[PDB]
Subunit: 335 residues, 3 copies
């Protein structure tokens, strides 16, 4: 009665992908929640596999290159992440999903790279207000958390500058393997690339016109039509409306409701093909104490849904009976 009876948990406290200090505290925000207890209460065995230590160079060792900020910290961190994810997913090769808590979204280049090494035919569902697919010369910000997909997409490689230290970051995704849900703040060059290469995408306008149910169905149809592929679910907390996830660095109004976020995760979970879910951009240093609690709570409900938690209830593992205790019931007494 469980699609997944065990799961692994990994923290990746990336913070060199964007300028606001605090994404490094994301994994701890989830560890100090009741997430682990609640997951155990649904009968799932969850193993805490610890944290990846990002590589964080100093400014002298890691100057701007092609406008990118902290690009060598990024390339080194990417390779370290990929090795660890690869090993975890191969020890796993009912499947055992890997739950990853970030950390800013730059971690995804590493997680997908390593995941693809174990499962090369995977698809990616990217849940985000943003495209995170800027190529370096088009990025206004130079922030690596806005570029992680570009390094992975084969079709985009003529717009990525060559760098010796990026050699091991091999493009492992075709444009046809990615689908977005939740977009509402694409940069113009992302829009161009997404349309040019036919990346499936469902923006908040699509959610409004189609409804989340049809959006989920169509996204799964686009990249995983017969549920043959492993799914890498990359969930940026900023996909959710700032009313329910305020503690994040690039909040955009008009986002997914928590319920819409839950539906995406419930449907993905129920495919039986959830292989990795990562949750990016939690920043417990942003907003009020209550803002952080709201954001933490949203994240926990989301990750629980990914692992198969049902809002319609779960049956007990053992049904309790009054008589076994030598207790007299009302029905018994009345007779």
């Amino acid at each position: 009665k469980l699609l997944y009876t065990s799961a692994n948990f990994l923290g990746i406290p990336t913070n060199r992908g964007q300028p606001k200090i605090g994404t490094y505290q994301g994994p701890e925000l989830i560890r100090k929640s009741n997430f682990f207890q609640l997951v155990a209460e649904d009968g799932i065995q969850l193993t805490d596999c610890g944290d990846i230590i990002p590589v964080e160079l100093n400014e002298a060792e890691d100057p701007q290159r092609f406008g990118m900020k902290w690009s060598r910290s990024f390339s080194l961190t990417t390779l370290r992440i990929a090795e660890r994810v690869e090993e975890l997913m191969k020890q796993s090769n009912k499947s055992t999903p890997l739950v990853i808590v970030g950390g800013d979204h730059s971690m995804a280049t590493g997680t997908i790279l390593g995941h693809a090494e174990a499962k090369p035919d995977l698809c990616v569902l990217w849940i985000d207000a943003h495209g995170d697919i800027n190529t370096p010369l088009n990025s206004a910000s130079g922030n690596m958390h806005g570029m992680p997909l570009s390094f992975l997409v084969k079709e985009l490689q003529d717009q990525i500058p060559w760098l010796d230290d990026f050699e091991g970051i091999k493009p492992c995704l075709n444009a046809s393997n990615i689908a977005y849900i939740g977009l509402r703040d694409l940069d113009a060059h992302e829009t161009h690339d997404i349309r040019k290469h036919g990346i499936a995408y469902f923006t908040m306008l699509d959610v409004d016109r189609m409804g989340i149910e049809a959006v989920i169905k169509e996204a799964l149809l686009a990249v995983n039509p017969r549920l043959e592929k492993a799914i890498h679910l990359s969930f940026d907390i900023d996909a959710l409306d700032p009313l329910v996830a305020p503690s994040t660095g690039t909040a955009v109004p008009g986002g997914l409701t928590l319920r819409e976020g839950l539906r995406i995760c419930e449907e993905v979970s129920a495919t039986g093909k959830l292989s990795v879910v990562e949750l990016a951009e939690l920043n417990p240093l942003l907003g009020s104490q209550e803002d952080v609690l709201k954001t933490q709570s949203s994240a926990v409900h989301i990750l629980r849904a990914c692992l198969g938690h049902c809002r319609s209830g779960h049956l007990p593992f053992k049904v309790r009976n009054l008589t076994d205790q030598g207790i007299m019931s009302r029905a018994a007494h009345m007779q």
Copy 2:
């Protein structure tokens, strides 16, 4: 042009059903609002029938029994509530609905018991994030507000321990007479009992997939197919999302929007069969001053909807005319 031209109002400041002090202030939160004025402005005559005084024993007089906390305060309070509700509903036997403001949800055992004494064929619509149908030996918390339905459901009586002081609490509901809307935090044994006995239930997942309109229709179909039965609407404020009802003791994210809550109440009201509506779990001692105002406001809009308030407008009782005042209009002047 009014389905209900008069109504009764009753406070029940129960607070021994759960541990957080403050539910006893629920009725006053509504009395100090503009609810009464607004109800009068729609042409309804609302009579304040005062408060029920709960029985609150001391710890020595009311030790834990079968893990239940304050069970004798509960049984005594239940009987006191039922007598008062019964008398009010029989003086009432256009019908006159009774509006009850709590108070924690443990009051429902008493309100339904008394209501059923006046109208034995009634149905119950239970609007709640929670099932409130735990039987005592299955309750992790021992909190009576999580058990009120179990004592009333005939099918569950072999799982209720006999207690002499509970004898007058007679099961007056069949499983087939109850429908839930809004559920998102069932305990495993509740899930078991609800499914085993075929209690109609529409969780937030059902609301997401079906839409509130279909959920309301199907809930009414399940328990009141031809609108032959009186309706007992038991509305836990925690059914609403914490964004609109934060001041309540067991808040769960991902709840009904205020609009969805309004639709449930509007449709129930429009049946002409609303006999009792109770609103449970307001706690003005929880949250900020603004949190309390939001929660108060949500409650007022909800109760107004129950009594027949229309968001699409009400016609004036007397249409005013400019000439009656001896005033010259623009149209008159221009001629």
Copy 3:
């Protein structure tokens, strides 16, 4: 690839239409936002045409007349607004929309009057929790922001008292030219007049039952069936739920989501017939600092949508290419 390549912007800091000081700061709230920058980034040339100076008489010069508060300030301000709007719209006679930021909603009598002078066959889409169509002797409050449409509707002129200084305020709208979306707090006499004269109206109950998509379609069908008419979009920020627009003087729970507000504006924009959009009732002196930021943000997203901003993305004006810079790509290197 742009329906509108230029636009005009006008502030109207009306504050004598209602009692709470602060609506006069509405235009500045938008000017100090990033609205202008974001509009330019989508390729639209936006010209700041400055502010209209409302006429604000003293109490001695402007006593109550027919219960109206500040009615002579209103009539004088109305004529001043209308002259300026008329001149702007005639210099404009791809069309050039006029974006107006208020200011309390009393400004609409002036904006529509002047707009109609340039485009007499226009239709009005009124997005508001309120009807703003009270005739003076029926207004409980005497606040002019609750009456602006009544002076304009030909069918209502036998209920408007004649005043010499209102002579230049000529009724320029038929009941058949107005459609409301968002209503949830009509006064009884407004309900009477709206139904009696067949004004198309879609309240929040209609939005709940029909969905915003059908509501927008039906509103446009009612007043602009073949998109032959110029559209005057009058958007009261209080149409939006107080959760996203708290800083406004008459907030009502259960409003449009930001997304629903965006859909209305996106569809209106896409007709190619958006001629004037005004945004009323911003009050930066109400609520917390965060409340004001939320309200500002909602307003900016709304006005951007009116001017044609697409949540699904915009293409770059020039597509950037790696080689033009003499940079070596990964694809190039690998070959």
